[PDB]
Amino acid sequence: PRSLKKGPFIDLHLLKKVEKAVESGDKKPLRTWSRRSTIFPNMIGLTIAVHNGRQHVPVFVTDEMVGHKLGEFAPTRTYRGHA
Template identity: 50%
Template sequence: MSRSLKKGPYINVKLEKKVLAMNESGKKVVVKTWARASMISPDFVGHTVAVHNGNKFI
């Protein structure tokens, strides 16, 4: 089910802070997250995000 356009995208705050900090520092580290519903914003491009599928990170 897609999210309503009037609500806007859901982006996990902790995940966004981690990626923005990596953008400022220039580091490229794999970010692990359990937030499966979080959308990937343009700031995330170029980074590797490992999402937990209930058993392991993929």
Template identity: 55%
Template sequence: MKSINKILYCNYKLLKKVNSFYSGKINIIKTWSRSSCIIPRFVGLTIYVHNGKRHLPVFIKREMIGHKLGEFSFTRTFRGHPKGKKFVRNDRRKK
């Protein structure tokens, strides 16, 4: 959990979108603000966070409060380890 002394940053436009979602004006919340903190008002919402290429859906849970939105929208894809070379251990112990 974040320190209590630090000020939490949340983008003003994102807050406006969340309020208009609760009032029924919009259906989807998209944001480019990866640095915004997750506040308790976001719990239960699915926010589409931009990862540099596309918007990825992030379902907000209670445990995520205090973290940044960008922590849950990954920017790099893991394609696996290289298949070519495997590490072979030489077992040269004295018997």
């Protein structure tokens, strides 16, 4: 994982988008491609639609998700079984 001395990574574009979503109200799903962004405490209760390569998967952020990357909640590969 990212070294603690550098802090948790988040894309600035998402950080500002979250801050504006928090202050405004219970806004719409936040569309992002920032799979690499850490889930911060202030994202709790937001829906982030996280890109998985072809679609923005809605991820309702809970307290347990904090510290994880957004990409963890948006699987990229489809697999249902071989037969």
